[PDB]
Amino acid sequence: ITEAALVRDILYVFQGIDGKNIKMNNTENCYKVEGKANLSRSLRDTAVRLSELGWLHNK
């Protein structure tokens, strides 16, 4: 996967809508991204850091 897709997708995760690559929706624990980009920081760390805005929106 590519980060250009992560931007358009996490833009929906701010509204709370489930994403293409970011499947999980705080059902257990919190939002989580599953991907094979294997970008340690971009695929996971930055994405999860930004997803908690969507989690707060969900609450």
């Binding site: 358009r8 997708d9 833009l11 929906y12 509204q15 809508i17 489930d18 994403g19 293409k20």
Partner: protein, 229 residues
């Protein structure tokens, strides 16, 4: 649909035998109810194979049509209309995100189709002067909803509108439509007429006292619907 025809006549008889000094109490022609177009509600590329941001423009076009009650190419209004709850069928093969956003945008369409049906069926003479003005002042807000979707069509023509911006623009009128549709559901369900549909408009106006986004709506509706009584 068929079951309303009884109710109208059963009400008419009570007024006829009650009042004989005023004769030949009015009725509308049969086609006023039979014709389905008079009321508000009634080459396709496979959406699977396109890129994403073009699917967005397509669904936005179909939803801008749905807001006025007319069907869309990729989204259909289900014709069941059982009980009163309108339902819609989005195309099965879409991007999950866009599908869910379409579902979250869709309740204003279900809360427009019932709102127009209420205005047609409860604007016949039989339901009474108060139930007439309730629909007749709900009808002005239907017009203003049409104004809004016309402006959205202009913006969409200029390629300058997206589904995410649509989401924001339809929030103020989503509350309007939800208040009108739940209120219509209650008025029809209780078979309330006369002052029974002037009590319910008082109690729903107490219901929201600090909101002031729906309170002005309800206060205006009752100002207009209490002119008859």
């Amino acid at each position: 649909l068929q079951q309303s025809l009884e109710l109208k006549r059963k009400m008419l008889r009570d007024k006829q035998n009650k009042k004989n000094s005023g004769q030949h109490l009015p009725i509308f022609p049969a086609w006023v109810y039979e014709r389905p177009a008079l009321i508000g509600d009634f080459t396709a590329l496979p959406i699977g194979t396109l890129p994403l941001a073009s699917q967005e423009s397509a669904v936005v076009e179909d939803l801008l049509y749905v807001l006025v009650g007319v069907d869309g190419r990729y989204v259909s209004a289900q014709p069941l209309a059982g009980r009163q709850s309108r339902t819609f069928l989005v195309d099965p093969n879409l991007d999950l995100s866009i599908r869910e956003l379409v579902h979250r945008i869709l309740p204003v369409a279900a809360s427009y189709s019932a709102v127009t049906r209420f205005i047609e069926e409860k604007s016949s003479f039989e339901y009474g002067q108060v139930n007439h003005a309730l629909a007749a002042a709900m009808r002005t807000l239907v017009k203003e909803h049409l104004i809004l979707v016309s402006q959205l069509e202009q913006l969409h023509r200029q390629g300058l509108l997206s589904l995410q911006k649509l989401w924001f623009y339809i929030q103020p009128a989503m509350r309007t439509m939800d208040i009108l549709a739940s209120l219509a559901t209650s008025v029809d369900k209780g078979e309330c007429l006369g002052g029974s549909t002037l009590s319910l408009l008082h109690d729903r106006s107490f219901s929201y006292t600090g909101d002031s986004q729906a309170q002005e709506l309800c206060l205006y509706l009752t100002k207009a619907a209490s002119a008859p009584y």
